[PDB]
């Protein structure tokens, strides 16, 4: 077809760059050279748990807005429906709730981001 062809040529292109990236310099890897970087001095421990409520406390809100915009997408086509007064309220409606949701977060101090 068309698109699958360009996908294949792109991915094969990139993979080609990878293979010419590795199988080319042809020199000596060895231990400690291959040790992970840690601004000089060795790591105090392998990566573990950078825990934060302040991650999900907002990131989840991302997810629930993204679901909303998923409903916003039909709008350009819906605009040409025969009966806009039946539509228009809803076109506003969701946006209000979107805003409303945000507004609720805005001031329950649930939006501390960072």
């Amino acid at each position: 077809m068309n698109i699958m062809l360009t996908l294949l040529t792109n991915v094969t292109l990139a993979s080609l760059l990878v293979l010419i990236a590795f199988w080319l310099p042809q020199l000596n890897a060895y231990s400690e050279k291959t040790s992970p970087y840690e601004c000089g001095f060795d790591p105090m421990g392998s990566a573990r748990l950078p825990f934060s409520m302040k991650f999900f406390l907002v990131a989840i809100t991302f997810l629930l807005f993204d679901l909303e915009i998923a409903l916003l997408l039909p709008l350009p086509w819906a605009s040409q429906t025969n009966n806009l007064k039946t539509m228009l309220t809803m076109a506003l409606f969701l946006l209000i709730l979107l805003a409303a949701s945000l507004a609720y977060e805005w001031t329950q101090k649930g939006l501390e981001w960072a």
């Binding site: 748990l49 825990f51 999900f56 989840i60 997810l63 629930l64 679901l67 998923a70 409903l71």
Partner: protein
């Protein structure tokens, strides 16, 4: 029914059996559940595309929404369970199955 549908349905059956074989930290289960969700979505949409039953073109996306929505909730609970342990299903306080 055309073989493709059978194949997606089977992908559902695996997307369930994976949820129920159910092992170690439970985050895998929220994944497997979302996979299940996706299989139901696709299996729906292929149908609404099939018969040109046009109104129902609205459903799959709406389906998706709530389904994604509950999963969006699910992580939050995991947080809490992750909050006291560093998650694993292997640790449950409640008694009597």
């Amino acid at each position: 029914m055309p073989l493709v549908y059978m194949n997606i349905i089977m992908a559902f059956a695996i997307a369930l059996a994976g949820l129920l074989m159910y092992r170690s930290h439970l985050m895998s289960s929220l994944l497997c559940l979302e996979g299940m969700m996706l299989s139901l979505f696709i299996m729906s949409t292929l149908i609404i595309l099939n018969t040109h039953f046009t109104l129902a073109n609205m459903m799959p996306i709406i389906l998706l929404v709530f389904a994604a929505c509950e999963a969006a909730l699910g992580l939050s609970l995991l947080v809490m369970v992750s909050n006291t342990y560093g998650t694993d299903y292997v640790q449950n306080l409640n008694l009597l199955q």
